């Protein structure tokens, strides 16, 4: 095509890793960059699905407010550090994956120390779980799920083992969104909207993936205007 | 309050449009330039009134939404039977009430 | 804004628009470039903010910043007291908890 | 018991602005700066 | 279907005439009524293109601030009444149509007095242009175009005849949009968005029609995110 349709949104992309992804799209008519950037933003933060630690079981610990010998951190500090952990499974078949880890003595426990699981990957290897001194016995089972949004540990109340303690759910894979609408000059008329939205992600999904899901949720919603009544 | 207030910006060159037709033009262009504001102390109509005239009630706000006129700007509008030189916001307030209770008049 | 420059982009329709209403206000020296106008505007302690719900800007610069804020202790009264029926004093027959 | 902030609670800066939480907004739609970073709390000016 | 998909946006409509049309759609997740209502609004006003008087030429009049003898109204009041005129052409072939009208003597000039044009129709016949007394000579040519949004007479500056005067562009069949997001209670969770948007229209098109076009423009725009670069 040549005139009005070839003059079409040149979707350009710039993505490093699975965390940052910039997305430019121009030219756009009058005040459209905003018309699009904003909904996608609203979606990108509320609507997209991910992974977060949903339950923990230290073997000798019973309640969340306990402290483990040979372990500098306290249960609550560690369960906190776990919320920081970002995992990534590859297919639906993986709804609830229990990651296992047991380390002893004078070693620092990082997320890479979790025994590998077939379809799951840990993007947060070097994250710090704990500092074990001597005779430091830590053997746990941290659950992991696929969900959406924020779910207080109180809301779900997970029950793997009776002495286990639930954790708060941090599911939006999207950390932050940002979009700019700067003028662009195309030949004839100067008023032009250029929409570029920067998306950040914990690693679970990718900026591009996110964006795609996003636009779909919108599309799916625009269809809901079908049957009058 | 903020919605209904009107603004006044810079008085440099002549503020006399009440009389000359060369006053409409010159201070219309001079305002297009950098010297006369849209809200200048010029008795009858600051060029801000000269530039925009709104037919029906709604026309007024549309221009506001498009970025033509701020709500606190001095504009002219045609209401029920009068050419009323009142700001966007003020006209909007008018409707809020007019709507709250439908006996508009 | 320095990173903004290098990261690849300039100023919004929105950012310019709030500037318009800001000079008509009197926060920015008319006649200076948006880049320069925003500095002025920033130094005043306020920056442009978009709605979040609409994506449009909030007409007029708004200040923002790092303020320390503490949380206050909840007294026993805080435990909102709701009583249907209950005990009664021995000599005075009025309700007692 | 862990007490996570909620609408009943009261927070106040060192100056004296005291106040209660009235609404927990979804990061989705609260005031956001040009770069995507949004504000945590929105204080009313009138109280100043 | 029964659980999550049957629980779907019940699109309900209420429309009287071709001017007013309410549209309700619930339930919606968190902060979605807003995510939808807002863009649709922005579209409903700028994108559903339309028609407005873009230029006028009274034959003996040179400037916009003149008054015509035998004519009660002044040029500025008439050019204003023209902004009130709503026309409707049937196909793209009609980008700029110049409507012509000439009336003399003790007659009232209404929009029906314009000489009919093949593919163009005037929905505003009885609108009042002017009141001619005696020896009242009014012969003009009022331009008409298809555009979008609001365009100040200063922005376009149309040039048909050198003594002609431009008029401000009022381009949409949609008079005003309005959307509300009130909470709705569906069994389990209370937080629910209910989106209902009220659309007003000059009559050219209908609220429903408008809305449909709207959602499409959005959809069409969500596709523009196809080919990376």
XYZ file of C-alpha atoms in Angstrom:
708
model
C 0.000 0.000 0.000
C 1.300 3.616 -0.621
C -0.462 6.790 0.791
C -2.624 6.786 4.004
C -2.299 3.127 4.994
C 1.491 2.779 4.237
C 1.772 5.866 6.416
C 1.186 3.532 9.306
C 2.354 3.017 12.856
C 5.926 1.980 12.559
C 6.054 -0.218 15.567
C 9.649 -0.149 16.720
C 11.030 -2.071 19.675
C 14.064 -1.880 21.930
C 14.385 -4.580 24.574
C 17.288 -5.631 26.778
C 16.759 -8.728 28.864
C 13.255 -9.570 30.065
C 12.969 -6.573 32.444
C 13.106 -3.448 30.233
C 11.404 -2.937 26.933
C 10.793 0.375 25.179
C 8.157 0.564 22.457
C 7.777 3.404 19.955
C 4.900 3.831 17.533
C 4.461 6.792 15.181
C 2.873 8.642 13.493
C -0.527 8.924 15.185
C -3.275 11.500 14.580
C -4.230 14.145 17.200
C -3.959 13.212 20.851
C -3.917 9.507 20.234
C -0.624 8.576 21.814
C -2.392 9.469 25.046
C -5.588 7.695 24.001
C -3.589 4.498 23.724
C -0.706 4.792 26.214
C -2.992 5.416 29.168
C -5.373 2.421 28.862
C -2.487 0.058 28.152
C -0.805 1.427 31.256
C -3.915 0.869 33.354
C -4.019 -2.649 31.985
C -0.319 -3.402 32.202
C -0.505 -2.871 35.949
C -3.806 -4.364 36.999
C -4.590 -7.040 34.443
C -1.340 -9.047 33.594
C -0.530 -12.610 35.563
C 2.716 -13.833 37.216
C 4.491 -15.774 39.974
C 5.082 -15.191 43.737
C 5.982 -17.222 46.855
C 2.661 -18.320 48.335
C 3.723 -20.518 51.282
C 6.789 -21.523 53.336
C 7.752 -24.439 55.606
C 10.878 -24.311 57.699
C 11.180 -27.721 59.260
C 11.754 -26.948 62.948
C 9.822 -23.622 62.870
C 6.091 -23.532 63.803
C 5.049 -19.837 63.699
C 6.133 -16.961 61.485
C 7.597 -14.998 64.381
C 10.298 -17.466 65.263
C 14.072 -17.280 64.969
C 16.322 -20.122 63.745
C 19.648 -20.812 65.537
C 22.812 -20.389 63.464
C 20.611 -18.200 61.243
C 21.165 -14.435 61.497
C 17.849 -13.552 59.820
C 14.533 -14.201 61.537
C 11.659 -16.075 59.965
C 9.833 -12.864 59.082
C 12.892 -11.342 57.430
C 13.447 -14.425 55.334
C 9.780 -14.839 54.318
C 10.172 -11.259 53.294
C 13.251 -11.943 51.181
C 11.323 -14.686 49.484
C 8.697 -12.241 48.258
C 11.645 -10.734 46.432
C 12.276 -14.009 44.627
C 11.203 -14.049 40.963
C 10.598 -17.406 39.261
C 9.454 -18.338 35.767
C 7.767 -21.518 34.617
C 7.220 -22.306 30.928
C 3.746 -23.890 30.613
C 0.157 -24.101 32.122
C 0.995 -27.646 33.381
C 2.835 -25.766 36.155
C 0.205 -24.153 38.428
C 1.793 -24.790 41.821
C 5.495 -25.686 42.004
C 7.138 -26.436 45.338
C 10.789 -25.434 45.306
C 13.027 -27.243 47.800
C 16.248 -26.181 49.471
C 18.356 -27.467 52.377
C 21.785 -26.023 53.321
C 23.961 -26.521 56.383
C 26.821 -24.971 58.284
C 29.051 -21.901 57.404
C 27.379 -21.195 54.027
C 25.405 -18.226 52.602
C 22.060 -19.376 51.227
C 21.208 -17.795 47.892
C 18.285 -18.602 45.555
C 20.583 -20.595 43.272
C 20.812 -23.128 46.068
C 17.250 -24.364 45.379
C 17.309 -27.810 43.722
C 16.515 -27.339 39.989
C 13.108 -28.255 38.699
C 12.501 -29.351 35.097
C 10.140 -26.687 33.675
C 10.933 -23.930 36.202
C 13.705 -21.294 36.085
C 15.020 -18.912 38.768
C 15.818 -15.399 37.431
C 16.806 -14.232 40.928
C 19.768 -16.599 41.673
C 22.075 -14.291 43.651
C 19.222 -12.972 45.891
C 20.131 -13.343 49.568
C 18.052 -15.700 51.648
C 20.173 -16.167 54.771
C 23.538 -16.235 56.505
C 24.234 -19.495 58.288
C 26.940 -19.581 60.991
C 27.814 -23.071 62.360
C 25.506 -25.977 63.112
C 23.105 -23.923 61.032
C 20.352 -26.225 59.895
C 17.889 -24.816 57.396
C 15.663 -27.082 55.348
C 12.556 -25.585 53.769
C 9.858 -25.901 51.147
C 8.673 -22.711 49.509
C 5.521 -22.926 47.417
C 5.177 -20.865 44.181
C 2.074 -20.089 42.124
C 0.663 -18.412 39.063
C -1.865 -15.695 39.838
C -2.844 -12.064 39.313
C -2.522 -8.921 41.424
C -1.998 -8.763 45.171
C -3.316 -11.385 47.545
C -2.710 -10.947 51.286
C -1.379 -14.046 53.051
C -4.574 -13.818 55.065
C -6.799 -14.077 51.989
C -5.453 -17.399 50.657
C -4.201 -19.210 53.752
C -2.212 -21.956 52.018
C -2.057 -25.406 53.648
C 0.789 -27.668 52.422
C 2.101 -28.660 55.826
C 0.338 -27.825 59.131
C 3.357 -25.910 60.500
C 3.782 -23.917 57.314
C 3.198 -20.139 57.117
C 1.559 -18.313 54.136
C 3.118 -15.318 52.494
C 1.686 -12.290 50.756
C 1.189 -12.671 47.003
C 3.067 -10.292 44.678
C 1.829 -11.321 41.239
C 1.958 -8.328 38.605
C 5.024 -9.167 36.562
C 5.083 -5.519 35.522
C 7.099 -3.294 37.826
C 6.380 0.083 36.259
C 4.961 1.617 33.119
C 5.743 4.958 31.521
C 4.680 6.635 28.324
C 5.616 9.810 26.518
C 3.896 11.626 23.698
C 6.428 13.832 21.943
C 5.717 15.735 18.711
C 7.027 14.312 15.455
C 7.223 16.100 12.110
C 5.883 14.361 9.050
C 6.115 16.480 5.926
C 2.876 18.459 5.570
C 1.404 18.870 9.090
C 3.482 19.210 12.264
C 0.911 18.311 14.879
C 1.648 14.632 15.348
C 1.549 12.298 18.263
C 4.440 9.886 18.830
C 3.673 7.261 21.435
C 6.503 5.462 23.175
C 5.804 3.432 26.328
C 8.527 1.998 28.541
C 7.704 -1.181 30.432
C 9.689 -2.804 33.239
C 9.192 -6.441 34.363
C 10.343 -8.709 37.237
C 11.444 -11.247 34.654
C 8.499 -13.656 34.885
C 7.154 -12.391 31.611
C 8.744 -9.988 29.152
C 7.891 -6.386 28.306
C 6.756 -7.394 24.846
C 4.714 -10.336 26.084
C 3.066 -8.112 28.664
C 2.147 -5.473 26.096
C 0.649 -8.118 23.822
C -1.488 -9.534 26.609
C -2.492 -5.994 27.459
C -3.734 -4.945 24.048
C -5.665 -8.230 23.949
C -7.500 -7.610 27.211
C -8.531 -4.314 25.708
C -9.606 -5.891 22.408
C -11.514 -8.600 24.274
C -13.265 -5.821 26.147
C -14.145 -3.853 23.034
C -16.030 -6.924 21.855
C -18.256 -6.945 24.906
C -20.245 -4.170 23.158
C -21.982 -6.740 20.916
C -25.481 -7.732 22.108
C -27.809 -4.742 22.872
C -30.634 -4.976 25.457
C -14.093 28.537 42.879
C -11.090 27.711 40.735
C -13.360 26.667 37.914
C -15.233 30.003 37.855
C -12.399 32.588 38.256
C -11.225 34.762 35.309
C -7.538 35.694 34.520
C -5.629 38.939 33.516
C -2.008 38.763 32.185
C 0.002 41.659 30.614
C -0.691 45.247 29.737
C 1.890 46.759 27.457
C 0.545 48.392 24.305
C -2.865 50.172 23.897
C -6.008 48.586 25.435
C -8.575 50.611 23.449
C -10.660 48.215 21.209
C -13.979 49.805 22.353
C -13.631 52.214 19.367
C -11.205 51.583 16.372
C -11.671 48.799 13.776
C -7.905 49.056 13.341
C -7.885 48.389 17.048
C -9.564 44.998 16.503
C -7.132 43.960 13.807
C -3.872 45.449 15.257
C -4.425 44.132 18.786
C -5.634 40.827 17.303
C -2.343 40.400 15.410
C -0.328 41.920 18.204
C -1.904 39.305 20.487
C -1.070 36.630 17.918
C 2.402 38.124 18.269
C 3.799 38.347 21.792
C 2.586 41.789 22.974
C -1.215 41.598 23.679
C -2.492 38.812 26.030
C -5.811 36.885 25.691
C -6.826 38.592 28.928
C -5.714 42.208 28.790
C -7.223 45.157 30.493
C -9.086 46.524 27.509
C -12.526 47.680 28.630
C -15.019 46.230 26.100
C -13.235 43.114 24.934
C -9.681 41.902 25.464
C -8.502 40.249 22.246
C -9.311 36.985 24.045
C -12.948 37.838 23.311
C -12.147 39.078 19.860
C -10.608 35.715 18.799
C -13.334 33.275 19.965
C -17.121 33.491 19.817
C -19.237 30.441 20.755
C -22.586 29.700 19.245
C -24.408 27.076 21.330
C -23.578 26.352 25.027
C -21.636 23.120 24.410
C -19.386 24.619 21.666
C -17.737 26.514 24.429
C -16.541 23.495 26.400
C -15.500 21.480 23.347
C -12.904 24.069 22.503
C -11.821 23.788 26.141
C -11.425 20.036 25.899
C -9.421 20.423 22.651
C -6.988 22.810 24.403
C -8.310 25.987 22.790
C -9.574 27.729 25.888
C -8.720 27.149 29.529
C -11.792 27.189 31.815
C -10.739 30.416 33.552
C -10.344 32.285 30.189
C -12.540 35.282 29.201
C -14.736 34.255 26.258
C -17.976 35.307 24.603
C -20.937 32.912 24.343
C -24.465 32.850 23.019
C -26.936 31.701 25.645
C -30.834 31.660 25.456
C -31.259 35.251 24.261
C -28.126 37.153 25.134
C -24.620 37.445 23.859
C -22.921 36.926 27.255
C -19.235 37.626 27.715
C -18.529 34.965 30.384
C -15.748 32.375 30.953
C -15.909 28.608 30.249
C -15.970 27.518 33.871
C -18.653 30.025 34.766
C -20.769 28.659 31.924
C -20.107 25.163 33.157
C -21.089 25.958 36.727
C -24.253 27.298 35.201
C -25.032 23.897 33.814
C -24.136 21.943 37.022
C -26.921 23.740 38.807
C -29.166 23.825 35.769
C -28.783 20.050 35.736
C -29.030 19.335 39.491
C -32.489 20.867 39.281
C -33.947 20.770 35.804
C -35.836 24.107 35.987
C -32.897 25.600 34.011
C -34.245 29.123 33.939
C 15.241 15.351 33.024
C 18.873 14.705 32.030
C 18.331 10.991 31.691
C 15.055 11.829 29.827
C 17.129 13.711 27.270
C 19.537 10.852 26.610
C 17.002 8.030 27.038
C 15.634 9.391 23.784
C 12.607 11.646 24.341
C 11.548 15.218 24.919
C 8.296 16.853 26.033
C 4.627 15.811 25.965
C 1.602 17.602 24.529
C 0.518 17.392 28.111
C 3.771 18.752 29.531
C 3.525 21.664 27.115
C -0.153 22.141 27.863
C 0.307 22.418 31.618
C 3.069 24.924 30.839
C 0.579 27.123 28.989
C -1.742 27.269 31.984
C 1.357 27.726 34.228
C 2.629 30.880 32.501
C -0.900 32.265 32.428
C -0.681 31.495 36.123
C 2.651 33.107 36.691
C 4.996 30.282 37.664
C 7.157 30.375 34.524
C 8.874 33.317 32.721
C 6.954 33.654 29.436
C 9.120 33.349 26.373
C 11.561 30.697 27.612
C 11.894 27.186 26.172
C 9.899 24.309 27.766
C 13.160 22.675 28.827
C 14.104 25.878 30.593
C 10.550 26.544 31.786
C 10.301 23.139 33.433
C 13.557 23.738 35.325
C 12.120 26.934 36.741
C 8.899 25.072 37.545
C 10.847 22.246 39.197
C 12.962 24.549 41.310
C 9.657 25.840 42.718
C 9.166 22.351 44.071
C 6.403 21.286 41.701
C 6.406 19.061 38.595
C 3.752 18.008 36.042
C 1.535 15.090 37.047
C -0.889 13.095 34.854
C -4.172 11.771 36.290
C -3.571 8.048 36.215
C -7.244 7.466 35.657
C -7.450 9.485 32.518
C -3.842 9.906 31.548
C -4.457 13.588 30.986
C -2.376 16.087 32.971
C -3.462 17.887 36.057
C -3.736 21.456 34.910
C -1.063 23.255 36.867
C 2.175 22.058 38.435
C 1.815 20.121 41.678
C 4.486 19.690 44.271
C 5.669 16.210 45.215
C 8.527 14.841 47.285
C 9.985 12.577 49.949
C 8.117 13.234 53.181
C 8.632 11.134 56.276
C 5.386 9.825 57.711
C 4.827 7.682 60.737
C 2.006 5.337 61.669
C 0.243 5.812 64.988
C -0.465 3.228 67.631
C -4.036 1.901 67.909
C -5.437 2.209 71.408
C -7.824 -0.317 72.939
C -10.680 2.061 72.157
C -9.665 1.734 68.495
C -11.069 -1.735 68.738
C -14.343 -0.331 67.835
C -16.728 -1.396 70.624
C -20.102 -2.715 69.473
C -22.461 -4.109 72.112
C -25.898 -5.728 71.588
C -26.767 -7.045 75.019
C -24.563 -8.023 77.898
C -23.936 -7.734 81.612
C -25.455 -5.141 83.999
C -24.144 -3.555 87.172
C -25.340 -5.018 90.502
C -26.695 -1.888 92.275
C -27.123 0.393 89.239
C -28.936 -1.585 86.574
C -27.176 0.073 83.675
C -25.139 -1.921 81.061
C -21.570 -2.826 81.966
C -18.834 -4.586 80.075
C 0.060 -10.476 64.729
C 1.164 -8.571 61.679
C -0.590 -5.284 61.138
C -0.544 -4.192 57.532
C -1.704 -0.572 56.951
C -5.443 -0.198 56.443
C -8.242 2.330 56.088
C -8.860 2.520 59.845
C -5.304 3.623 60.576
C -3.883 7.059 61.304
C -0.472 8.356 60.117
C 1.154 11.737 60.724
C 4.363 13.581 59.887
C 6.559 15.222 62.485
C 5.064 18.644 61.829
C 1.598 17.866 63.028
C -0.370 17.007 59.954
C -2.375 14.195 61.449
C -4.836 12.176 59.443
C -6.554 8.915 58.748
C -6.418 6.711 55.697
C -9.661 7.024 53.845
C -8.953 5.180 50.668
C -6.347 2.728 49.385
C -6.093 3.375 45.689
C -4.938 0.868 43.089
C -1.523 1.954 41.720
C -3.497 1.589 38.469
C -5.043 5.063 38.585
C -3.388 7.253 41.263
C -1.304 10.429 40.297
C 1.716 9.413 38.241
C 4.719 11.477 37.221
C 5.927 11.703 33.549
C 8.334 8.809 34.084
C 6.058 6.010 35.199
C 6.842 6.360 38.959
C 3.549 7.046 40.906
C 2.999 8.775 44.254
C 2.379 6.804 47.433
C 0.179 9.257 49.354
C -1.851 12.321 48.314
C -2.147 14.972 51.025
C -4.841 17.670 50.899
C -3.435 21.231 50.652
C -6.256 22.854 52.621
C -4.917 21.345 55.805
C -1.839 23.576 55.472
C -20.668 -21.387 29.130
C -21.173 -21.180 32.956
C -18.548 -19.776 35.447
C -16.005 -17.039 34.490
C -17.022 -16.468 30.855
C -20.843 -16.556 31.418
C -20.100 -13.972 34.085
C -19.636 -11.574 31.247
C -20.329 -7.961 30.429
C -24.075 -7.745 30.195
C -24.271 -5.098 27.567
C -27.539 -3.259 28.211
C -28.843 -0.389 26.096
C -31.381 2.394 26.552
C -31.865 4.721 23.593
C -34.590 7.235 22.834
C -34.521 8.783 19.381
C -31.178 9.180 17.629
C -29.839 11.809 20.075
C -29.632 10.128 23.475
C -28.373 6.646 24.221
C -27.295 5.219 27.565
C -25.107 2.137 27.615
C -24.444 -0.010 30.681
C -21.939 -2.841 30.946
C -21.148 -4.823 34.073
C -19.453 -6.528 35.846
C -15.899 -5.447 35.126
C -12.778 -6.155 37.142
C -10.842 -3.481 39.061
C -10.758 -0.030 37.598
C -11.777 -1.117 34.172
C -14.901 0.932 33.675
C -12.514 3.833 33.689
C -9.985 2.133 31.458
C -12.721 1.747 28.837
C -15.035 4.738 29.261
C -12.228 7.260 28.983
C -10.695 6.139 25.668
C -14.143 5.672 24.083
C -14.958 9.203 25.182
C -11.779 10.632 23.671
C -12.641 8.814 20.452
C -16.372 9.606 20.468
C -15.503 13.287 20.322
C -12.506 13.559 18.047
C -12.684 10.489 15.774
C -16.365 10.055 14.688
C -15.627 12.620 11.941
C -18.333 15.037 10.891
C -19.357 18.223 9.107
C -19.180 21.975 9.996
C -19.268 25.357 8.119
C -15.619 26.158 7.305
C -15.936 29.400 5.332
C -18.410 32.075 4.272
C -18.661 34.688 1.553
C -21.296 37.420 1.633
C -20.998 39.211 -1.678
C -20.883 42.927 -0.644
C -19.244 42.197 2.781
C -15.422 42.324 3.175
C -14.702 41.801 6.902
C -16.386 39.614 9.560
C -17.388 42.655 11.670
C -19.666 44.203 9.062
C -23.437 44.674 9.026
C -25.656 44.167 5.978
C -28.467 46.660 5.207
C -32.031 45.311 5.312
C -30.510 42.549 7.430
C -31.255 42.715 11.164
C -28.455 40.289 12.121
C -24.808 41.307 11.785
C -22.204 39.227 9.945
C -20.824 37.818 13.224
C -24.283 36.676 14.424
C -25.010 34.996 11.118
C -21.600 33.268 10.837
C -22.430 32.086 14.318
C -25.845 30.739 13.277
C -24.103 28.855 10.497
C -21.963 26.983 13.028
C -25.370 25.711 14.204
C -26.091 24.271 10.751
C -25.784 20.483 10.483
C -25.354 18.884 7.043
C -24.793 15.325 5.918
C -23.120 14.062 2.758
C -23.356 10.376 1.682
C -19.881 9.490 0.349
C -16.073 10.223 0.447
C -16.345 11.839 -3.027
C -17.748 14.795 -1.039
C -14.829 16.336 0.888
C -15.620 20.032 0.443
C -19.126 21.064 -0.652
C -19.988 24.722 -1.211
C -23.649 25.389 -0.468
C -25.148 28.380 -2.218
C -28.045 30.631 -1.209
C -29.423 33.988 -2.383
C -32.669 35.524 -1.042
C -34.117 39.026 -1.501
C -36.684 41.337 0.061
C -39.245 40.763 2.964
C -38.376 37.064 3.439
C -36.947 35.063 6.398
C -33.896 33.108 5.353
C -33.848 29.580 6.716
C -31.417 26.739 5.894
C -33.997 25.119 3.592
C -33.471 28.083 1.266
C -30.055 26.759 0.187
C -30.109 25.347 -3.353
C -30.182 21.526 -3.097
C -26.982 19.616 -3.886
C -27.114 16.037 -5.277
C -25.231 13.947 -2.626
C -25.757 16.451 0.267
C -28.687 16.738 2.736
C -29.605 19.444 5.260
C -30.908 18.069 8.580
C -31.281 21.616 9.945
C -33.838 23.152 7.458
C -35.854 25.409 9.817
C -32.729 26.892 11.493
C -32.821 30.699 11.351
C -30.169 32.441 9.284
C -31.581 35.965 8.949
C -34.518 38.348 8.807
C -34.567 40.451 5.624
C -36.631 43.696 5.637
C -36.963 45.485 2.239
C -34.318 45.885 -0.457
C -32.556 43.186 1.545
C -29.921 41.646 -0.676
C -28.136 38.635 0.694
C -26.178 36.328 -1.621
C -23.597 34.022 -0.052
C -21.520 30.889 -0.410
C -20.965 28.844 2.715
C -18.261 26.181 2.530
C -18.790 22.782 4.240
C -16.186 20.086 5.090
C -15.551 16.714 6.662
C -13.121 16.735 9.539
C -12.548 15.825 13.152
C -12.710 17.707 16.438
C -12.475 21.461 16.865
C -10.511 23.661 14.514
C -10.333 27.433 15.235
C -11.046 29.637 12.179
C -7.518 30.953 12.721
C -5.962 27.471 12.415
C -7.316 26.663 8.942
C -7.794 30.068 7.315
C -9.810 28.966 4.302
C -9.385 30.797 1.005
C -12.240 30.346 -1.539
C -12.775 34.032 -2.335
C -10.419 36.815 -1.111
C -13.215 38.710 0.734
C -14.474 35.537 2.435
C -14.222 34.975 6.198
C -13.335 31.666 7.907
C -15.486 30.132 10.612
C -14.647 27.932 13.559
C -14.908 24.188 12.909
C -17.403 22.138 14.950
C -16.880 18.653 13.574
C -18.699 15.735 15.381
C -22.152 14.113 15.261
C -21.584 13.567 18.971
C -22.674 16.443 21.165
C -21.437 15.209 24.530
C -20.154 12.091 26.234
C -20.460 11.090 29.880
C -19.440 7.991 31.813
C -19.946 6.810 35.342
C -18.234 4.000 37.220
C -20.418 3.003 40.162
C -19.798 -0.009 42.358
C -21.865 -3.148 41.832
C -22.173 -6.144 44.137
C -21.698 -9.596 42.697
C -21.927 -12.309 45.310
C -18.416 -12.975 46.644
C -16.365 -9.783 46.113
C -17.793 -6.260 46.392
C -15.150 -4.333 44.508
C -16.630 -4.152 41.046
C -16.646 -1.646 38.275
C -19.900 -0.876 36.453
C -19.409 1.213 33.355
C -22.246 3.199 31.929
C -21.569 5.912 29.312
C -24.220 8.344 28.064
C -23.846 9.611 24.507
C -25.646 12.552 22.905
C -25.827 13.025 19.099
C -27.004 15.733 16.664
C -29.075 13.103 14.904
C -26.752 12.532 11.917
C -25.686 9.226 13.420
C -27.064 7.389 16.452
C -25.520 6.893 19.890
C -25.206 3.147 19.250
C -23.694 3.636 15.804
C -21.239 6.171 17.193
C -20.150 3.827 19.978
C -19.603 0.978 17.500
C -17.476 3.127 15.239
C -15.583 4.249 18.310
C -14.666 0.825 19.629
C -13.542 -0.061 16.092
C -11.179 2.876 15.772
C -9.686 1.662 18.980
C -9.481 -1.945 17.790
C -7.988 -0.844 14.484
C -5.396 1.036 16.485
C -4.569 -1.931 18.700
C -3.597 -3.819 15.552
C -1.026 -1.237 14.591
C 1.265 -2.962 17.138
C 2.022 -5.784 14.686
C 5.339 -5.416 12.787
C 8.361 -4.694 15.091
C 11.434 -2.749 13.798
